[PDB]
Amino acid sequence: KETAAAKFERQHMDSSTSAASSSNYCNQMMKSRNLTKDRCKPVNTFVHESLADVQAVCSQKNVACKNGQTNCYQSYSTMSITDCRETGSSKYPNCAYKTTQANKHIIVACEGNPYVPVHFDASV
Template sequence: SGSSPSSNSNYCNLMMFCRKMTQGKCKPVNTFVHESLADCSQKKVTCKNGQTNCYQSKSTMRITDCRETGSSKYPNCAYKTTQVEKRIIVACAGKPYVPV
């Protein structure tokens, strides 16, 4: 099916296109989370950019990592699909305080 990457090496190519991440240029990296997103009351951690509004999930989550391949060239964006289970970090903002 279109929402499950389990055996589909084209998952990233399809999802990046459907989510309009290949318009104008190829987005180099994107992560799709296949479970309810961690809420903003989890363990607080420092974000990669130094901000302090990031939170780490308490448990591992099923995610799909999409990375542009070396042969990818706009408008023919191409992605490598990798499925992983790991804790994720989300940034939170706004009122109510929600993942962004």
Template sequence: MGLEKSLLLFSLLVLVLGWVQPSLGVESRETQTQKFQRQHMDEEGHFPSSPTYCNQMMKSRGMTSGSCKPMNTFVHESWETVQAICSQGQVTCKNGKSNCHKSSSTLHITDCRLKGSSKYPKCDYTTTDSQKHIIIACDVVHYDASV
């Protein structure tokens, strides 16, 4: 029953967010779910095979336009696997809200961190590949942490 309820709530969220159509910029035209997928999902097998993975991905996903996003995580699992986390262990988010859920198993992820000497427009990232649990917020899709 919990899984069905979570999936129903998630589907409702996607439907509701799909109706919101702000007017300016790529980020404002996409739903929260689309933004999450653009910024955090890389299930198509683009596993980091080189130290330039993060530089390429951050640029191609629009996270180096106007400024360098300091940190980002890509999840190398199916969208269905990530959605299922919403029915797994509930935890408190970093912002104190109680809508976060922690994956019950470790997932293949890549952390991209801006190098200290890097300055916009030449954003230069370190690429760290690992297996970790992830935490996501489920009422508004948001990547919260990896542990």
């Protein structure tokens, strides 16, 4: 199986680059991080910061989650992030995505010990 924190890192962590390289970044990343293994993950955001910085958000601003949960936190500063969304002409197994780079405040849900991100709620 896969832990909740490991899935987060796998799906949303990309310290490798500082920004979404080109407009094909998403098509590559969604494939490499196995987000299109047996299905095309329709939407997914990647964070371009260290793991440390992303985990630190679990001890920053405590905001409400979109689903109502009270374990979401918002990063005090904006972060470099890439939003990946399936294009209208996309379909498993040939998944297609639109890359959208931006610096926004990430909002993640945290849990466990250590208290780390286990779900990407959104970016503002």
